[PDB]
Amino acid sequence: IXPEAPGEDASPEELNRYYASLRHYLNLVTRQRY
Ligand code: CNC
C-alpha cells in the first residue's frame, strides 16, 4: 500500500495526519485494531 502523504504545514502535526492515514489504510485492508 501507499497512503496520503503530507509536507505543507508543520512536522509533528503532519506526522499525526500520516499516522491517521496509516491506521485508516490498515483498517481498509487487514483485521488488526487500534
Ligand atoms: C521516500 O523514501 C520518502 O522519504 C522522504 N523523507 C521523509 N522523511 C525523511 C527524512 C530524511 C532525512 C530523508 C533523507 C528523507 C525523508 C519523503 O517523505 C519521501 O516521501 P514521498 O512520498 O516521496 O514524498 C512525499 C509526497 C512528501 N513528503 C514530504 O514532504 C516530507 C513529509 C515529512 C512530514 C516526513 C514523512 C512523511 C516521512 N518521514 Co521524515 C519523518 N518523520 N523521516 C523519516 C521517515 C519518514 C517516513 C518514511 C515515515 C515518512 C515518509 C512517508 C511519505 N511517503 O511521505 C526517517 C528517515 C528514514 C530514512 N530512510 O532515512 C527520519 C530520518 C527518522 C524519523 N523517523 O523521524 C525522518 C526525519 C528525522 C524527518 N522527516 C521529515 C523530513 C518529515 C517531513 C516533514 C517536513 N517538514 O518536511 N518526514 C522531518 C523534517 C520531520 C521531523 N521529525 O522533524 C525530519 C528531517 C530532519 C529535520 N530536518 O528535522
Burial label, 9 (beta-carbon count in 10 A; 0-12, 13-18, 19+): exposed
Q: Are 3 and 21 in contact (CB under 8 A)?
A: yes
Ligand 1: atom nearest CA of 5 is 55
Rounded to whole angstroms, how far apart are CA atoms 22 and 34?
11
Which residue has 506526522 as its cell numbers? 15
Cell for 1?
A: 500500500
Going from the Cα of 25 to the center of ligand 1, the distance in angstroms, rounded, reads: 19
Q: Are 20 and 32 in contact (CB under 8 A)?
A: no
Ligand 1: atom nearest CA of 15 is 34
> Taking CB atoms and a 6 Å cutoff, what residues make up the pocket around ligand 1?
5-7, 11, 14-15, 18
Method: NMR
Q: How far is CA 8 from the centre of its chain?
A: 15
